[PDB]
Amino acid sequence: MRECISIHVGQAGVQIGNACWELYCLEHGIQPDGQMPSDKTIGGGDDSFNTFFSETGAGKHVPRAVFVDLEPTVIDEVRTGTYRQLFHPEQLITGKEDAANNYARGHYTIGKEIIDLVLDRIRKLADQCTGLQGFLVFHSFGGGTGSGFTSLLMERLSVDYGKKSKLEFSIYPAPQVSTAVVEPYNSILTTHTTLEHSDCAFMVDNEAIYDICRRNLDIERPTYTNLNRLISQIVSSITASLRFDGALNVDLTEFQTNLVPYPRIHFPLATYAPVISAEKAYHEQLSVAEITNACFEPANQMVKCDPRHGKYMACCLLYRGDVVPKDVNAAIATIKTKRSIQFVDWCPTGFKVGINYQPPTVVPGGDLAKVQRAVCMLSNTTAIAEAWARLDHKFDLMYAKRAFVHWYVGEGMEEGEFSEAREDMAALEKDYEEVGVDSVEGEGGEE
Amino acid sequence: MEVIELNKCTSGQSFEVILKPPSDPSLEEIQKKLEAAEERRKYQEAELLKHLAE
Amino acid sequence: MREIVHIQAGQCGNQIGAKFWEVISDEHGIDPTGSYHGDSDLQLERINVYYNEATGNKYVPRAILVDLEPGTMDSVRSGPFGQIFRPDNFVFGQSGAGNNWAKGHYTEGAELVDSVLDVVRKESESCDCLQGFQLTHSLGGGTGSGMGTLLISKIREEYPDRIMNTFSVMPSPKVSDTVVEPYNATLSVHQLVENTDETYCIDNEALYDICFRTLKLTTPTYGDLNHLVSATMSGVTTCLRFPGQLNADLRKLAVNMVPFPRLHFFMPGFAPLTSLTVPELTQQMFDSKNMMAACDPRHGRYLTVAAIFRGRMSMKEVDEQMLNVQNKNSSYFVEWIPNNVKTAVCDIPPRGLKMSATFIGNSTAIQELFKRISEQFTAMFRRKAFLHWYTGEGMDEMEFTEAESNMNDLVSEYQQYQDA
Amino acid sequence: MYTFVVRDENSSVYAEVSRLLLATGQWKRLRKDNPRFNLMLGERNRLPFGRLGHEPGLVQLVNYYRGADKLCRKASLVKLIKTSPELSESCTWFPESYVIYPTNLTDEREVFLAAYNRRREGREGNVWIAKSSAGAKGEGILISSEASELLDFIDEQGQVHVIQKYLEKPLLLEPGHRKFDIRSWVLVDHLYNIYLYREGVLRTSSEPYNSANFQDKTCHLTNHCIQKEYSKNYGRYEEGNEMFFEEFNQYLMDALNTTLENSILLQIKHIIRSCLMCIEPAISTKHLHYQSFQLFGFDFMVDEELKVWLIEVNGAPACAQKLYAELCQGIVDVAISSVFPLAPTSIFIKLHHHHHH
C-alpha cells in the first residue's frame, strides 16, 4: 500500500474537499467520529483504504489531508461541521486576509508568508507514510488563493518531493457563479506556472456542472452545495481505484501512464452518467449500454466541448455497480458503429475498463438518486482545448487594454509575467491543434 | 475487438479492449523570485511615502 | 478582512453619516442604546465589520465624528441614535472652516488633524484585521472637503496597504450654499484621484431632482436628500455587512470595479423610487432617473457594474433579468471587459420595503460630472474671483491651476475608454 | 430584439440575409467581435466554433456546420464516399475517383494507374480529369486521355488533387450541342431537416461539345467565369448562360418526352439526402450547446442516358442573381425565424424517406 496526501487550497478547494471526504467516509463505512467498525485491524494496517486514511491507536480513521485558505471563514466551517472530529488542528491552516481574487497577492505577497507553515504541515503527514505516492491538489483557477498560492505550493512540492506524482482537480471559471472579473487572468497565470509541476489535471468547468444540475437535477438555481456534491461523485469515481481493491489505475503513476502519453497535454476530459434527481418519483433504471452511450454526449461532460472534432489519445471507462465485461464490450461495439471516435495514429484505438461492483454511494438528503450502475469516462481528447481557447480569448480582450493589470503589478508581479504566461498558453493551444487536427484542403468562396 | 489483461477480484474486475492497433526551479530560485517581488512592493511603497513627504 | 473604520467629516458628512448609522443599526437589530434585539442570525454574523462589542453585549459603531465647529455634532449627539456613538470619538474644533478648502486642509484643519488620527489609531488598534476606511463628506464646503482630504492623505501615509473608500457629495448650483463650491470640489477631486480606491459620487442635483421630479416632494430639504443617500449607502454596503460571496470586502470590490487606478468614481443608484416585481426592480435600477450622479449612462459606457438585490425573490428570475439587461443593451458595456456585471442577493430587505435593488456603476459618463465642475471653476477662476479667501490662508493661484489641470486629465482618461 | 454579427463581408448570400433581418425591425447588428449575439454569420475559415454556446441567457445559432468540410473539399469527398459503407467504393452516382498527392509530399496513384490500364486494354473510353480544391475558378484543371500527362500535371502542383473519370457522354442541349451542369441549393436547419430549394440553375456552355479536343476547355468546362471570358458565344442561348428549371423542364418534354422531376430530380434528391444523412452523426448539433444551419450548393452532371452524377458540394455557395431575394428570404424563414420567432407554399422541398427493410 502506498499513501496519497490530499491538499485543498482556497474556498473551492476546501468546500469540494469537504464534500469528497464526507462521501469517502460513507463509501468506506467510516463514521463522523472516525471509527470504522468493519476495520478489524485496530490502530493500523495496509488496506487499500489506508491510502487515504491513517489510523490512531484509538481506532480513529484520519484523512491524509491538509486544508489551506488565506482567510478563515471556510475552513472554520470544517472545524465546526459534521466531520470535525475527523481532523486535528495541524491539518487546518488559515491566514487572516485573503488574496482578493488576485493571483499575485496569493502567490507573492501572502504566499511568501504562509508557504513554510503549509510545507511543515504536509511534512508531518508525509512522515507518517511508509511509501508516499504523491499528492492530489484541489483548487479553483479563478480565486487568488486557488490560483496564486497553488502554483507556489506546486513548485515547492516539486523541490521537496521530486519523485512524487501530483494530480489536480481544478475548477474552471464560469460567470454564472463566478465572483471576479479577473478570473481569466488568474487561470492563465496559474496554468502557466503549474504546467510543468502537474502530471495529470482533471478540469471541471462550473458551467457544465451548473447546467447538469439545472437540466438533470431540476435545480432552478444551483448552489455550491449542489455543485460540490456532484463534483464529489466524479472525484470519488476517479479516485476509487486508489481506495479499493483493483488492477486498473492503482497508483498515481498509472494515471499518467494510461491517460497522458504527451506530458504538456495532461488534461483528461471526465464524463459522468447517469445523473438522476432524487425527487424523481418514477425512474426507469439505465442499462450498461445506455450509461455507456451517455459518455459520448457533450451534455454529460465536465467541460462542454465536442470530441467528434478532435482526437483521442486515451480512453478509460470506470464503472460502479451492476456491470459485467460482456455487456461493456457489447455496448462499446454498438457505440463504435454510431459515434465519431478517432484516435491519434500513434495510440491504439481501445478502452481500459475498471468495474467496481459497489454502486455509487449517495449522501442522504442529497439531490442525486440511487442508481444500479454508473460510469465515469476519462478520455484524453484534444477537444478539451476549446476551453483554453475560450479562456485565452477573454484574457486577450482585457490584457490588450491592460485592464486590471495594476492590481497585479502592485503586488510586485512584473507585467512580463502576463505575456510569458499567455505565450505558454498559445504554445499549448498549438500543441493540441498539431496532435488533433488534419490539414483541411485550401481553396482558391462565392462558388 | 480483443479483450486483454482481464483481472478479477471480489470487489470488481478490469480489462482492456482493443479495436485497432496504432500505425524545475530550485529552492534558491523560488526564494529569489519571491524576494524580488517583495523588493518591488517595497520600492513602490517607498516612492509613495516620498510623494506624501513632499 | 474584517473591520472597517468609518469617519464622517463636516456638516454634510456628519448629517449623512448619522442617518447611515440609524439605518444600518435598525437593519442589524441594534437599538439606540447599542443593545441587540433582532430575530435573525444573519444580523450578527458580520456585525463586527461596522461595530465593536462592549461589556453587556453592547455594540458600538466603529465611527469617528469630525468637525471644525461643534454645531452639527451637538445635533448628532442629540439625535435618535446619538447616544450609540463612542463619546471619545467626537473630535471637533470651535473656529469653523468658512466653506473654505484652504481652512480645512492647511490652517484650521491642520491644527485638529493629529487628534483625529489619535482616535483613528485607537480604533484601528483594536481591529483583528482592518480592511480599511470609509469616509462620508461633501466636496463643496471646507471641513469635509479640505480637512476630509487632508485626513485621507495622512491615513494613507500611516496605513498605506489598506483600502480607502469615500461617499463624496458633489456640489451643484441648484442646491448650493456658497459660490466657492466649485473651487472646493476641484481641489478635493484631485486629492480623491490620488488617494482613494473607491469613491461613490453623489450629486446634490440628482438627489434634488429625484426628490422633486420623482418622489413629488415640492420643496426638498437637506433631510429629504439625506434620506435618499441613507438608503443608497445601506444598499451599497449590504455585501460588506451580510454573509455573501461577491464583493464581500472592500478590496475584492475594488478588484472587481476598478480596471485603471484613477478611474474609481462610481455612480450609485437605488430602486424603487416611487411617489414590485423582479423585472420592474431591474429596469428601475438601470434607469438614469434612479441614479445619483446626474450623468446620463447612455452618454458613456460601463466599465464595470455591481448590482445588489435585497428581499425574498427568485434568484432564477434575478439572474434572468440581469442577463436580459446586458444582452439587450450590450453596446453600453465595454466589450473588452468580459462579464463585467456582477450580481449579489441578500435575503434581508431594507426597512419599509419587501424588495429593493442597488446599483453601482463605473461608467465613463461620470466625466460629465467633472466637466460641469470644471466649467463652474473656470467661469470664476478666469477672473480670479473669490480667490482672496484662499490666498489669505497661504495658498497661491498655481495650486488652483494644477487642480484644474488634474481634473481635466481625469475627464480625458474617461473619454479615452469611451472610444476604446 | 434579436442580435447578430457578420464575420464574412464577402458573402453575397448573407449580406442579403443581413439586410432582411434588419428590415424586420426585430434584429440588431452588433460589432463583429461582440460576444452577446444570437446569430453568427460566420467567417469561411477557422470559424471559432469553440467559443459558441457559452453565453448564459442567449440561444446561439451559427450558419455553418462544424465538420461539413468533409463533404465540401475535393479529396475529402472522394475519401468520404469510398470509406462510408452506405455510399461506398461502388457508389453508382459518383464518378470513379482517386486521390493523388504530388510526389513532392494515403496516395492512390498505383490504384488509379491500375484501373486506367485495365480500361486501355479493354478499349474503353479513358478520359480523366485532374482537379483540386485549390483550383481558383477556371484554372487548376486538366482533361486528358493520357495518364502520364495527368500525373505529371499534379506533380507540378503542391496540394492534393483528385483524378476522376471524365464523363464522355454528357446530355447535350439543342440547339448548340452543348454541355451544362446543374446547381441545386440545399438548406440544412438546426433540426437536420434537409430542404431543397425548388429553383435550381443549369450553368451552360455556349460552345458546341467537341470530344476531339480536350485542350480547349471552353466547351468542356461550364464554369461561369470561363464561359463569360473565353466563349465568343457567351449568352447567345440564355442570359448569362443560365437556364432555369421552367425552361429546362419544357425542353425535356418537347425533346425527350419526359419531365425534369422524373428524369433528373428524383436522382438529385436521392443523392443529396444520401450525402447529408451519411455525415449527420459527425456534424449534427442536436444535443449541442450551440446550434448550426448551413446552405450548400450541390453540382451535378447529367449523361445522355439521363443518369445523374454528383460532381461536388460547395460549402459557401453564391446564388443566381434573380434567385437571391427568394432564397434568402427562405433562409430567414426556415433557418433563423424557426429558432428566433418574429413578433406559402414553401419555396423548399423537404427531403425525407423512410423505407422499411
Ligand SMILES: Nc1nc2c(ncn2[C@@H]2O[C@H](COP(=O)(O)OP(=O)(O)OP(=O)(O)O)[C@@H](O)[C@H]2O)c(=O)[nH]1
Ligand atoms: N464548484 C465550486 N466552485 C467554487 C466554490 N467556491 C468557489 N468556487 C469558484 O472558484 C472561483 C473563486 O475562487 P475561490 O476558491 O472562491 O477563491 P479563493 O481560492 O478562496 O481565493 P481568495 O478568496 O481570492 O483568496 C469562482 O470561479 C467560483 O465560482 C465551490 O465550493 N464549488
Ligand SMILES: Nc1ncnc2c1ncn2[C@@H]1O[C@H](COP(=O)(O)OP(=O)(O)CP(=O)(O)O)[C@@H](O)[C@H]1O
Ligand atoms: N468528371 C467530370 N466530367 C465532366 N465534366 C466535369 C467533370 N468534373 C468537372 N467537370 C466540369 O468542370 C466543372 C466543375 O469543375 P469543378 O467543380 O472543379 O469547378 P468548381 O469547383 O469551380 C464548380 P463550383 O463553382 O460549384 O464550386 C463542371 O461544371 C463541369 O462542367
Ligand SMILES: Nc1nc2c(ncn2[C@@H]2O[C@H](COP(=O)(O)OP(=O)(O)O)[C@@H](O)[C@H]2O)c(=O)[nH]1
Ligand atoms: N446632501 C446633503 N448635502 C449637504 C448637507 N449639508 C451641506 N450639504 C452640501 O455640502 C456642501 C457644503 O459643505 P458642508 O458639509 O456644509 O461644509 P463643511 O461643514 O465645511 O464640510 C454643499 O455642496 C451643500 O449643498 C446635507 O445635509 N446633505
Ligand SMILES: [Ca+2]
Ligand atoms: Ca486497520
Ligand SMILES: [Ca+2]
Ligand atoms: Ca515532476
Ligand SMILES: [Ca+2]
Ligand atoms: Ca487656530
Ligand SMILES: [Cl-]
Ligand atoms: Cl521524493
Ligand SMILES: [Mg+2]
Ligand atoms: Mg477565498
Ligand SMILES: [Mg+2]
Ligand atoms: Mg454648511
Ligand SMILES: [Mg+2]
Ligand atoms: Mg461543378
Ligand SMILES: [Mg+2]
Ligand atoms: Mg468548388
